[PDB]
Design a binder for this molecule. Structure first.
Ligand SMILES: [Mg+2]
Ligand SMILES: [Zn+2]
Lengths: 303, 195, 120, 99, 80, 358, 109, 49
């Protein structure tokens, strides 16, 4: 109360019942407030960023929850890391936070001038699965219902599927393009999925070894670490930031992440002990290669 | 008179269970009460398999939302497949692929280090147990009921709850509290109740 | 006087052991003394003397409660439990041939622990 | 890392826990001998459970070594237990008194 | 400290058949063991004890979760 | 119309052909027959029904059906009278909570009074639970063989207020009713997954992204039903599940038929090219109602611009977004037709349950 | 504590300064606000509204940060930017006084 | 005039003449071997230097 120049607990403010101009009210943090988010050690300029507060009303939760793509700012993982968070309360601090310390300013690294955020692990493999041409079942298509299911949880404005019959089969590149048209860019690069070292073995689909985007229309190749991965220079999010802004780059990162995650929600992905088990012929071939290594080593020994 | 009473302090409510006022070495009495806390596995508590893969528990999915196999089996923990290749913790996967057959046969096996092991023969044991050669099974998405296209590797992996609790480590202090007398700054740490 | 003695005696492990053996033989109530008046009863039965009598004299380790079954140490778990308590009392009062009796009871407890390890 | 975590693991921390008054000790109610045990378990009590683990992608909530836990497995008693703390205070002299 | 009332994973009440299963397993181990001390049973290289038929006779289905948590859960009365 | 075809019912029985089982049961429990309550397995076949409806039925039976628990009233665990130092209130409460009961009356209050008058470690069993309240039980509501915590020698444990608590398995898992045992689509062909070339696939010869299975087989297991009333217990469960789903769909319909008075659950926008966007928010709703609504709306409006929902784990709510090339009244009436379709198919399922199992 | 010793080598009222202002035709600093200057202007105006409350915006806003941000965007900020790098020993401060209503505004988005 | 701290389980520990059940009722772990020192309400382990 400015009239009394003292602070008061609302437990005894029942009779006053009102505020007045020149009064200062200390109110609980709400969704949409800006909060400073830090992880020691603070080595980079992006170690302290301003995120928007999303209050989780479930009382059983006591952790700080943040998108996996945001870890690249703080070099954090979820193996037990602890991070600091303080909500600015002064008006100058809030203005400064939301205008200068917002994490959109740190999307492009101050260190290497490239992007730091992107798709990591789950979303990278999900984008690869979604954008590839053929699945083991044949063509990589989905009906209208599952195409809409992909866009269910992107928080954007969902596109128009009124032109598709319920039995119409939408390609993965189709839905990725319907997402990328909101920020049309041009991208043409080989994907990390295509490697010369693998090439002699396994038959690469010729429609997957070259990624091409024209004005947001992804019509070629797959999306993987080179195109959407975090810290990939010249990736699609870097171009989105250059053309439309780092905030739009973060929005596109989230949207593409949700596309990939939902496509894997319906496509599934796993690693098994038999994925890493060689066939007996392959085991004999590995033995032969190692025997040749040891043979030339023993030739050195004989010399 | 004057007051030197002790305040509880901790945000997490506790229960008292201690009837004792002992007789110390200096021949004087002291309190020594014991507080009991009800600790389930909260979101944020750390777990780890015997191969050294730590992981913070962040999801509380009801039993209906959990993915389930064709024959009703659902997991307790869902761990990301990406946690394996960089760490090369193949012991965890072999433990799972042996534990499936062991659970089906109702046996317990020795997986001590440097004992003879044949991954091919363990997988053939899985096959002769009625499951697939790999531990993979047909799972259905719990939320939507749709089946995943890829057969999912699911089995019993021994897991440990590391004693780094979220409720112990979380802290939040308001705009006031105890201050250091010398520099006028808040005291250090959660124990000092500020800073 | 009586207060510090009550605290100290209540906190000995020996008091707990003797009191639980008394509870087993139904000499003291299986409640824990609800009001001081029954606490005197529990002290008298467990230790053998009222606290004032304990302070009066200087020989305290013998009149402790002894099992009111006198089991034939020659159902198996009952025998082991009561013989172990008797050997605990004998050690506390320093009975003459404690060492060889402890050796043979250690052998018997080893056999019983093996048979309990089979159940594990 | 396992040598560290197995020693950090919550379980039956002390067989005589009720008699003790220990600061910051956690007693995990349910423990299981691993389906794949080792020679070490002849000499020490195992600490943990044979949780059913699915190595799969589910909504991306388990990225960067997080774990998705069934709420029912939590409720039924998985990895639950009791956590203990102790508050002891002695009088400075006869000047003080509890009350 | 005991076999859980229900399987942790799924909730099938294995606790009904627990108390029967401990004694039945003890009896079956008695027959399948040989000249081997109880503390050396988890060390025998010529010892194989399958509880599949026993649990099946208990009426517990061919579920990995239920059988795991039945045959593996430690009993406090056995160690303390 | 027979959506719900034949149903197999098979209780889980104790096989006294094993000598060890018979000897153990007679040695401690004096058990010579099957238990008063048995876990029954129910396998059901559905035809001409969307996957969403079958999975919603499955989920509802799993956790969302209001089920009963045994619980301890606060203060029931007598700290003074319970001597045992190992049987904490938390451990015994957890043991007693997850005893699957088949309770017909909600006023049955049980009490535990166990004194270990001996030198052996006495084990408390479920037969130690003494009922003093409500009508006298002519049939036990739980098996008398459950192991509640043991007792050390000379120790006692007294719990005087153990009552029957109603809840749904979603909030607390002790209310979970059914456990799944099977689920498979009968119209989709399946590969021989035993072969190497197909081991890494789900087995179905169609992708999940394109499949629309209409013939299912849903297998559920119920943890404890009375031995001589298995069919009636199963029918009660299935009819209750259908009733719950109908009730929740009707609750959504209640706000649907109120296209004015902008309640903070329905917000309708007309935007851009005469398109209508409808957002529905229900707090504490799950993927059951959301997936049902989405599936049946997409059935009713095959050329819809966009229908989709999201049950975010936080915010604890379902937000259903429908965009269609129609006026607000037209979209509302189409969605009401979809809701009535859901109600109709679940009434058909209930009627077929009664026809089939009986 | 021993200071590890490399032991390396090397009128209390200041005279008042007259504020000399560079004429607008000789200002060499950029005519576009730096994000620092824009942030500072928005913060200063937002706090001033927090303490005073008067405004010149025809649209009602419920938060001072929004009123200040929109005042900056619509080029009616009642604050001048004084850019100053000079202090001569002669006791003279050389500053450039910039009106943000004439300067270009950075992204801030 | 001296008192020397006794390691739990050593031949001068009182538990050395107590049986496993006797330790159980006293308050010791029957299965734990000992090898630590009790000093001012704590347990201390003299490590192998
Ligand atoms: Mg870390
Ligand atoms: Zn189970």
């Amino acid at each position: 109360k400015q009239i009394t120049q003292s602070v008061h607990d609302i437990e005894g403010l029942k009779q006053d019942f009102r505020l007045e101009v020149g009064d200062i009210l200390y109110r609980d943090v709400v969704t949409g407030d800006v909060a400073f988010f830090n992880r020691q050690p603070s080595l980079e300029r992006s170690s302290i960023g301003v995120h928007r507060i999303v209050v989780l009303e479930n009382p059983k939760i006591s952790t700080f929850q943040m998108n996996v793509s945001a870890c690249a700012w703080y070099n954090a993982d979820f193996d037990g890391d602890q991070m600091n968070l303080w909500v600015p309360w002064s008006v100058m601090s809030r203005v400064e936070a939301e205008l200068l310390c917002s994490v959109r300013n740190w999307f492009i690294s101050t260190k290497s001038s490239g992007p730091v955020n992107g798709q990591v692990q789950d979303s990278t493999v999900g984008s690869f699965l979604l954008t590839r041409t053929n699945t083991p079942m044949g063509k990589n298509v989905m009906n209208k219902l599952h195409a809409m299911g992909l866009f269910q949880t992107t928080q954007t404005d969902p596109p128009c599927f009124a032109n598709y019959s319920p039995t119409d089969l939408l390609d993965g590149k189709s839905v990725v393009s319907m997402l990328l048209r909101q920020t049309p860019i041009n991208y043409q690069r080989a994907p990390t999925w295509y490697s010369e070292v693998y090439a002699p073995y396994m038959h690469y689909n010729k429609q997957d070894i070259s990624t091409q985007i024209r004005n947001g229309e992804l019509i070629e190749g797959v999306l993987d670490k080179k195109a959407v991965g975090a810290g990939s220079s010249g990736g699609i999010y870097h171009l989105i930031s250059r053309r439309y802004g780092p905030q739009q780059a973060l929005k596109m990162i989230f949207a593409t992440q949700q596309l990939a995650l939902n496509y894997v929600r319906n496509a599934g992905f796993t690693v098994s002990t038999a994925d890493m088990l060689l066939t007996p012929e392959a085991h004999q071939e590995v033995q032969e290669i190692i025997n040749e290594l040891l043979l030339e080593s023993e030739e050195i020994n004989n010399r | 008179y004057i007051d030197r009473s002790v305040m509880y302090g901790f945000d997490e409510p506790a229960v008292v269970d201690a009837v004792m006022r002992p007789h110390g070495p200096n021949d004087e009495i002291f309190g020594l009460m014991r507080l009991r806390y009800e600790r389930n596995l909260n979101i944020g508590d750390k777990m780890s398999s015997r191969s050294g893969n730590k992981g913070i528990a962040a999801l509380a999915l009801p039993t209906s939302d959990m993915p389930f196999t064709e024959d009703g089996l659902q997991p307790d923990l869902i761990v990301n497949p990406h946690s394996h290749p960089s760490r090369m913790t193949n012991g965890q996967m072999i433990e799972t692929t042996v534990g499936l057959a062991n659970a089906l046969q109702g046996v317990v096996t020795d997986g001590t280090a440097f004992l003879p092991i044949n991954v091919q023969l363990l997988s053939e044991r899985l096959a002769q147990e009625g499951l697939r050669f790999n531990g993979c099974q047909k799972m259905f998405n719990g939320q939507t009921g749709e089946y995943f296209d890829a057969a999912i590797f699911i089995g019993p992996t021994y897991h440990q709850r590391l004693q780094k609790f979220v409720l112990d480590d979380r802290y939040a202090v308001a705009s006031y509290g105890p201050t250091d007398a010398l520099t006028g700054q808040p005291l250090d740490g959660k124990r000092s109740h500020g800073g | 006087d009586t207060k510090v003695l009550l605290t100290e005696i209540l906190l000995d492990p020996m008091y707990d052991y003797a009191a639980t053996v008394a509870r087993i033989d139904g000499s003291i109530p299986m409640h824990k003394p609800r009001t001081p008046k029954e606490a005197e009863y529990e002290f008298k039965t467990v230790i053998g003397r009222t606290p004032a009598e304990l302070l009066s004299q200087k020989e305290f380790y013998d009149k402790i409660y002894t099992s009111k079954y006198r089991p034939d140490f020659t159902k198996t778990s009952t025998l082991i439990y009561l013989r172990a308590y008797e050997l605990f009392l004998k050690y506390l009062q320093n009975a003459p041939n404690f060492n060889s009796e402890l050796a043979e009871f250690k052998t018997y407890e080893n056999a019983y622990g093996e048979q309990k390890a089979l159940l594990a | 890392y396992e040598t560290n975590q197995g020693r950090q693991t919550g379980g039956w921390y002390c067989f005589s826990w009720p008699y003790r008054v220990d600061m910051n000790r956690f007693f995990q109610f349910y423990n299981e001998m691993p389906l794949v045990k080792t020679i070490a378990h002849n000499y020490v009590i195992p600490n943990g459970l044979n949780t059913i683990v699915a190595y799969m992608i589910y909504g991306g909530y388990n990225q960067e070594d997080s774990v998705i836990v069934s709420q029912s497995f939590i409720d039924r008693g998985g990895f639950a237990g009791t956590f203990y703390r102790e508050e002891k205070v002695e009088l400075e002299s006869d000047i003080e008194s509890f009350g | 400290m005991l076999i859980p009332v229900v399987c942790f994973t799924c909730g099938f009440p294995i606790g009904t058949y627990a108390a029967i299963f401990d004694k039945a397993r003890t009896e079956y181990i008695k027959t399948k063991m040989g000249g081997t001390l109880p503390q050396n049973i988890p060390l025998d290289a010529s010892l194989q004890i399958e509880l599949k038929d026993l649990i099946t006779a208990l009426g517990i289905p061919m579920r990995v979760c239920c059988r795991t948590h039945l045959i593996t859960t430690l009993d406090y009365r056995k160690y303390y | 119309e027979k959506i719900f075809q034949n149903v197999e019912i098979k209780p889980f029985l104790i096989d006294f052909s094993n000598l060890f089982i018979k000897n153990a049961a007679k040695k401690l429990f004096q058990l010579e027959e099957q238990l008063p309550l048995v876990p029954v397995n129910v396998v059901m076949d559905f035809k001409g029904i969307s996957r969403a409806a079958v999975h919603g039925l499955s989920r509802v039976l799993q956790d969302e059906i209001p089920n009963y628990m045994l619980d301890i009233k606060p203060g029931g665990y007598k700290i003074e009278d319970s001597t045992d130092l190992f049987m904490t209130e938390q451990f015994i409460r957890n043991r007693i909570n997850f005893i699957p009961i088949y309770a017909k009356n909600e006023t049955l209050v049980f009490a535990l009074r166990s004194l270990n008058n001996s030198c052996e470690v006495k084990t408390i069993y479920s037969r130690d639970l003494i009922q003093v309240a409500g009508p006298k039980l002519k049939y036990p509501i739980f098996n008398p063989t459950f192991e509640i915590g043991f007792l050390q020698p000379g120790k006692s444990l007294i719990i005087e207020d153990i009552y029957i608590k109603k809840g749904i398995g979603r909030k607390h898992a002790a209310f979970n009713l059914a456990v799944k045992t099977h689920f498979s689509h009968l119209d989709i062909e399946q590969y021989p997954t035993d072969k190497k070339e197909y081991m890494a696939l789900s087995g179905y010869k169609q992708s999940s992204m394109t499949s629309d299975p209409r013939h299912h087989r849903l297998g559920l297991c119920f943890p404890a039903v009375p031995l001589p009333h298995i069919n009636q217990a199963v029918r009660t469960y299935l009819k209750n599940a259908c009733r719950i789903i109908i009730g929740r769909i009707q609750s959504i319909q209640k706000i649907y038929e109120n296209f004015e008075e902008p309640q903070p659950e329905l917000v309708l926008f007309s935007m851009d090219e005469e398109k209508t966007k409808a957002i529905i928010t229900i707090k504490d709703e799950t993927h059951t109602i959301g997936n049902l609504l989405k599936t049946y709306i997409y059935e009713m409006i095959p050329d819809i611009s966009f229908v989709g929902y999201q049950c975010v784990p936080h915010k604890q709510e379902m937000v259903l977004t429908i965009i269609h090339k129609a006026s607000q009244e037209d979209l509302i009436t189409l969605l009401e037709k979809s809701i009535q379709n859901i109600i109709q198919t679940f009434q058909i399922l209930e009627k077929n349950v009664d026809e089939l199992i009986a | 504590y021993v200071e590890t010793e490399e032991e390396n080598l090397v009128f209390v009222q200041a005279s008042s300064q007259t504020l000399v202002i560079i004429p607008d035709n000789e200002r060499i600093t950029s005519n576009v606000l730096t994000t620092f200057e824009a942030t500072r202007l928005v913060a200063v105006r937002a706090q001033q509204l927090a303490i005073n409350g008067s405004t010149m915006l025809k649209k009602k806003y419920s938060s001072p940060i929004d009123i200040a941000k929109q005042e900056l965007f619509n080029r009616k900020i009642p604050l001048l930017v004084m850019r100053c790098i000079k202090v001569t020993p002669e006791g003279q401060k050389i500053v450039e006084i910039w009106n943000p209503r004439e300067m270009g505004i950075p992204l801030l988005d | 005039v001296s008192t020397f701290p006794i390691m739990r389980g050593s031949n001068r520990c009182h538990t050395h003449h107590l049986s496993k059940t006797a330790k159980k009722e006293i308050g010791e772990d029957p299965n734990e071997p000992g090898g630590y020192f009790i000093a001012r309400g704590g347990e201390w382990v003299v490590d192998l230097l």
